[PDB]
Give the backbone structure.
Amino acid sequence: XGXXXXXXXXXXXXXX
Amino acid sequence: XGXXXXXXXXXXXXXX
Amino acid sequence: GXXXXXXXXXXXXXX
Amino acid sequence: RMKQIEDKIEEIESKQKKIENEIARIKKLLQLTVWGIKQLQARIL
Amino acid sequence: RMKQIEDKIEEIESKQKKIENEIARIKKLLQLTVWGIKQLQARIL
Amino acid sequence: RMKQIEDKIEEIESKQKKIENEIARIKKLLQLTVWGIKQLQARIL
């Protein structure tokens, strides 16, 4: 749902 | 296989 | 690459 | 002086139990996530 | 003997904080992986 | 009194090392799960 850095294919795991 | 709280779509991650 | 080099995941690279 | 040491030990010991309980909770959750990855891979393969 | 003990205790408390900080980092990464699994399963289903 | 404290300290240090080793094992396994999530996502995408 909400999270994942707001999308961008996962944002490299929300930046780790 | 077996686990996942016995189904129900995942049991919200086996209850957290 | 990684994953023990394949074999379906190597049972999770052997835990 | 000795009492102060004993008091610090009691706080350490309590905190260590708190830590051990937390580690046990994390290991269990991690085990669920390993299972989820395995279940998703099987549905893919 | 008491000064040596007091130093050992400080070091134990320092190690305990490093551990607590490490647990916090683990838990945060585990929150991210749980989310990734949830997101993947929702897409597949 | 002193010897009992000294023994307690060694015991506490032992328990901390067990915890550090447990945390190391958990981090390794959590890193494998991150690899797996990324592999699964790539396949889906």
